[PDB]
Design a protein around this ligand. Sequence first.
Ligand SMILES: OC[C@H]1O[C@@](CO)(OC[C@@]2(O)O[C@H](CO)[C@@H](O)[C@@H]2O)[C@@H](O)[C@@H]1O
Ligand SMILES: OC[C@H]1O[C@@](CO)(OC[C@@]2(O)O[C@H](CO)[C@@H](O)[C@@H]2O)[C@@H](O)[C@@H]1O
Ligand SMILES: OC[C@H]1O[C@@](CO)(OC[C@@]2(O)O[C@H](CO)[C@@H](O)[C@@H]2O)[C@@H](O)[C@@H]1O
Lengths: 399, 399, 399
Amino acid sequence: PNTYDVTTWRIKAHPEVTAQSDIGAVINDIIADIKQRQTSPDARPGAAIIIPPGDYDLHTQVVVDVSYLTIAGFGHGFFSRSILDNSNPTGWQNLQPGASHIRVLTSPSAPQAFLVKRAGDPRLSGIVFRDFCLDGVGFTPGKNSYHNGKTGIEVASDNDSFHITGMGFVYLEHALIVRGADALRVNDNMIAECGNCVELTGAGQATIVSGNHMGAGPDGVTLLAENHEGLLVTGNNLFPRGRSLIEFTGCNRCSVTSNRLQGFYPGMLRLLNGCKENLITANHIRRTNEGYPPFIGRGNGLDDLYGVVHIAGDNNLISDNLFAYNVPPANIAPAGAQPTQILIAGGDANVVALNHVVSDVASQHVVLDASTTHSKVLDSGTASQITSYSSDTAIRPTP
Amino acid sequence: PNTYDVTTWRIKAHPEVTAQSDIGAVINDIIADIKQRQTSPDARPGAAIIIPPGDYDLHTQVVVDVSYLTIAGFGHGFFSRSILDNSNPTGWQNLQPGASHIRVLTSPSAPQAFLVKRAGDPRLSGIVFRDFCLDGVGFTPGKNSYHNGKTGIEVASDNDSFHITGMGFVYLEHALIVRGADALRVNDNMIAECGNCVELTGAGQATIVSGNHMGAGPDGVTLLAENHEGLLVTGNNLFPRGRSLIEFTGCNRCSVTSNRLQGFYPGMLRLLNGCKENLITANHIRRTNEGYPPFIGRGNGLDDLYGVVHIAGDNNLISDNLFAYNVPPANIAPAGAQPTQILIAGGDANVVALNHVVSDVASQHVVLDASTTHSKVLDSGTASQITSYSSDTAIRPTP
Amino acid sequence: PNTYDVTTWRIKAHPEVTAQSDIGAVINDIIADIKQRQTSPDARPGAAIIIPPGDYDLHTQVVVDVSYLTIAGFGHGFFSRSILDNSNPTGWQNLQPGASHIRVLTSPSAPQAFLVKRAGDPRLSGIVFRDFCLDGVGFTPGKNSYHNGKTGIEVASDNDSFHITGMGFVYLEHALIVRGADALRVNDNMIAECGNCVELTGAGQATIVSGNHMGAGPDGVTLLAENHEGLLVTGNNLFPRGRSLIEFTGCNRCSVTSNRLQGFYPGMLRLLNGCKENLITANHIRRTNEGYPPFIGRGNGLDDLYGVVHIAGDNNLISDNLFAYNVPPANIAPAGAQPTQILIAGGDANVVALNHVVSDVASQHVVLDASTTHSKVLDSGTASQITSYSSDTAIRPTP
Ligand SMILES: OC[C@H]1O[C@@](CO)(OC[C@@]2(O)O[C@H](CO)[C@@H](O)[C@@H]2O)[C@@H](O)[C@@H]1O
Ligand SMILES: OC[C@H]1O[C@@](CO)(OC[C@@]2(O)O[C@H](CO)[C@@H](O)[C@@H]2O)[C@@H](O)[C@@H]1O
Ligand SMILES: OC[C@H]1O[C@@](CO)(OC[C@@]2(O)O[C@H](CO)[C@@H](O)[C@@H]2O)[C@@H](O)[C@@H]1O
C-alpha cells in the first residue's frame, strides 16, 4: 500500500512512456494517483516511490506537491564524468553513473528534475529524497564549463522537516536548492562535479548539513546559506572547485565545525553581508593550486588578499582551525603580496583565537581591515604575521 | 523470508483487526509468529517488520522481546501539531503527520507504543527502529500541555548495540527511553514537540547521539543521560523548550561537541550530581526569550543565576563555545541581576577556556561558586565579566 | 528490475546450493547474471542484492567486479561473541549474531567474504555495502586470540565513491579493508570484537569515517590510514583493545575531531612515519587499565613513555582535547616512570594547545623529544608537567 515501483507502473493514457523513456512522466502520473486516492486533509499519509537499479531518462519535470513523499532508490551511483570527459575512453568498462540512475534531460522551460512546491496552507513537510542518482549528462558549450541549465532537486516553497540523504548528484548546474528550509537535513550525500551543490536560499531555521562529500564549480557555490539561523554544518568533506566552499550571506548564530575544506582559490569560507555571532571552529582549511590540468588556469576572480576565510559581520568566533596553504609564489595575486589566511573585512567584536597557519610563503595569518572595531586576535600568529588596521584591536602573539 | 509487511498479515483468530485499526495487535501477532518459528537460541536471526506509507492506529502496546528485530518504514513524516493547534485549520491541506504514521492511542496501563524487554540471559541486542512515525495525537488537558501519558519507544532491559535512526517522533509525553544502553546509536532522527525527547536512564556505555533534530517540553528533557560513560553527543541541532537541552546526572568522561543549542530558559546544558571529566566544546549556545506567542510566559522555574551552562562535578573542560544571549532586561531573573553564561556550581579542577560571550546586557561570563576549588578560567572574559567566589581560582583575562 | 533477493535465486547448475549453505556461491551466480545482462559499458547501472533476515553460511569468496553494486540487508545484528565465549551459555536465549547474518567460513586461499576488485579501466565506483552482518564465528587456537584468518569486506583495487554504512562486523581478523580509497564513506557502522576494524591502505583522498562504533584487537588496528590526504574522522566512538585506536602512517592534512577514544594501552592515537599538517582536536582521550578479566594481562608491547598520543611529523595541531588517565602505578611501564599524555617524537612546528589532563598519577602532559624543533606548547600543563628536550620549544604555562 502507497508503495510504487517506477518500473511496474503504466501510464494508462500513455502505455509505452516508461521509466526508461521518461521517468518524469511516470512519477507525475504516480503523484496524480496519490492525490487521486488521498483527498482528505486528515488522510494524506503520502507514499513511497521506489526507483530500481537502472538507467532512466527524465524529459518531463516532476512537480512534487504532496507532503511526506518518499522517492528512494538503492544507490547514489556516483561516477566522475569529469575524468571521463578529459580522458581517453578506449576500452573503458563504464562510461556512465549507475545505481538508480536518472538522466536529467530537462527542457529550458522546466530546468528542475524535481520541483517541490505547493500553494495554500500547510507548508510541505516530511518529504524525503534518498539513495538514488541525478546525472546532468554533460556540460554545454564547453565540456568543462559546469554549465547546462539543469537542476536536480529544487524546493521552492517553505518546507518543514525535509530529509535529503544517501544521494548522488553529478554534472548538474544546480544539484540541490532549498528555499525557506526549516529543520532540514542534508546528510550522507555525494554532490560533486556540479556547478553548484547545495543552495539554501531565502531564509532558514535549525537546519543541518553534515556527513556530505561536496565539489562544485568555479562559477558556483558548494554550500550556500541565505539568512539562516541555527545552521549546523559539521563533518563534511568539501573539496575542490566551487568559487567558495562555504558561503553564508547574512546568516546569524550558525556553526561550521569539524569539517574538511580543500579549495584552489581565494575565499573558500565566506561570511558576507553582515553575518553575526557565528562559530567557525575545529575545521581543516587547505588552500592550494588547482592540480588537475584540464582546469589549470581557471579562477574565481578573487585575489589572495580576499583571504582564505573572509568575515564581514559581528561577534563571530573563528578558532581552533588549521590552515595549510601551499601556493606557487607566481600564482599569488597580487605580485609581491603576502597571502591572507583570515581577513576580517568589517564588523565588530570578531574573535580570532588558536588558529595554526602553515604556508610555503610569508603570509599574514590574520588581517583586520580599517573598518573593523574591537577585534581580538589570540594565538593565531606572531606580531609580524598579524596586520591590524584598526587601533582598538587586542592582539596576543603566539609566543 | 523473515520479512513481514504489516498491511498483508492477518491475525488468524482476529481477521478484521488490521494495521489500520490496531497495528499494535498486528505487530504482536507477528512477533508471536517469529517466536513460533525461531525456537533455537542458535537459530534466532530475528526478522524485519515493514510499515507501508499510511495512517495506523495503535491501541495495543507492543512488547518486543526478540533480538535483532527491525521495524522499519519509509519516512519520519513529521508535522508540527503544535502550529496546527495554535492556528486556524480552515482550508489546510494537511491536519496530520505522515509517512509510516502510527497514532499512539495507548491505554494508561500500557503507556508505551513499543516496550522492549526480556527476562533471562543474553541481553537483547541488535534491535533496530527506523524510518517511521510515532504520533501522540494530542496533549491533555491543555492543548499546549506537552502531557498525555504516552510513550513512543521504551527499552527497559539492558540492551546491546541498539540502533534508532531516521525516525519521526511527535506529540508524545516521552518519545524515546533507553535504560542500560550499551553501544547504542541514536542518529539522524527528528524528535520534537514531545514532552521529553531522549532519556538514557539507569546507566550506560559507549553510546552515540548525533545528527538529531530535537525540541522538548518545559517540564521535560531534550537529551538526558544517567550515569553514562563514553557518551558522545555531536552534530545535533537542539532547539526550543525543554527545561534543559542537554542534561547529564553523574555521567563521567562523556563528550558534548559540535552541537547547536537554542533554548528559552536557564540551564540549557546541565552537568548535575557530580559529573566528572567531561568535554563540552565547540558548541553554539544561544539563550533567548520564547518566540512563539502560545508559549510566551512559560518557564522552567530557574532564574538567570543558574547559568546557561551549569556544572557540578570535577575536571570538566568547557571550552571553544560561543554564547549568544539575548533576553529582555525585564525577563531576567532576579531583577537587577546579571545573567550567568557559565556557572561552576561546585567541584574541583574545572577548566573554562576560550568561550566567547555575546549578550545584550552586562553578563557574568563565568561564575565559580564558593564551593569550587582549583578552577581555571582562560580567555572567557575580562576580569569584570568573571566572578570567582573561590580563592584558588586561576584566571587569565581575554586581553 | 536489477533487484535480487538471495533466498529466491536458484543456481541453475547447482539447485540445492542455497544462501543458507553457501550464500557466497549464490551471490557469485547473481553477479554472473548481472554481467550476463549488462554487457554495454554505456549500460551498466549495476544492481541490488537484498539479504533477508537470516542465518547464512559463506564458504565461497565473493568477487565483486561490477560498479554500483549494492548488497543490503535489514540489520547489523551485532552480538558480543566475546562475552559468550567467556561466560556460561546455560539457558542463554541467543548464542549468535542476527539480522541478515552471514557467517564467514572462508578457506585460507580466499580469506575475504567479499573481495572487490577489477582490472582494466574505469576504477570501480559507487559500490555500497549496507545493513547486514559479517560474523567470523570464532577465534583460533585461543578463543580470545582475535585471530582466524578471515576478512569481511576487502577492496583491493582503486575505488571511487564507495559507501559502507549500517553494517555489523563481528569476530573477524580483518573486518574492513579498503586500498586506494577516494571519496570513501564509512559511517554509522558497528565494527567490534574484530582483530582489525578499518584499514585504509595504499593511499587515499577525501575520505570520511564518522558515526562509527569500533573495538579491535591487541594485535590489530582500530582505524588505520596509509598515505591519506583529506581524511576526516569525526563523531566516532572508539573503544577498547586495538593496539591503537587511530593510526595514521604518512597521512597529510587529515582531521581527527569530535571523537570518543577509550583504550587500555599506550599509543591510542598514532601519527607515524612523517604525518604532516593534521588536526587532532575536540577529542576525549581516556586511557585506563583493561577492565574485562579474560583479557587482563594482555598488552601492545608499548610502555607509558610512548604516550597516549604519539606524533612523528610536522605542523600538526593537537588541541582542545581532554585526557583522562587512570592507570595503577604498578601497571605503569617503566617502574617509577611518569606517564606521557602527549609525545612529540620528532618533527617541526608541532603545536600543542589547550589540552586538559586528568590523571591519578604525576604525569608529563607533553613531552617534546630532542629531535623536535620549533614546537609550541600552550595551556597544556604547568612547567613541571611539561618536558622539552629541545631548546627552541616555546612554552606557556596553564596559569
Ligand atoms: O579537485 C577535486 C575535483 O577534481 C575532480 C576531477 O574533476 O577529481 C579529480 C580528483 O583527482 O581530484 C581529487 C584530488 O585532489 C580526487 O578526490 C579526485 O578523484 C572532481 O570531481 C573534484 O571536484
Ligand atoms: O522554539 C521551537 C519550538 O516551537 C515550534 C512551535 O511549537 O516551532 C515553531 C518554530 O516557529 O520555532 C522555530 C523557530 O524559532 C522554527 O524552527 C519553527 O518552525 C516547535 O516545534 C519547537 O519545538
Ligand atoms: O573494552 C571493550 C571491549 O570489551 C568487550 C568484551 O570483550 O565489551 C565488553 C564491555 O563490558 O566492555 C565495554 C565496557 O567497558 C562495554 O561497552 C562492553 O559491553 C568488547 O566487545 C569491547 O571491544
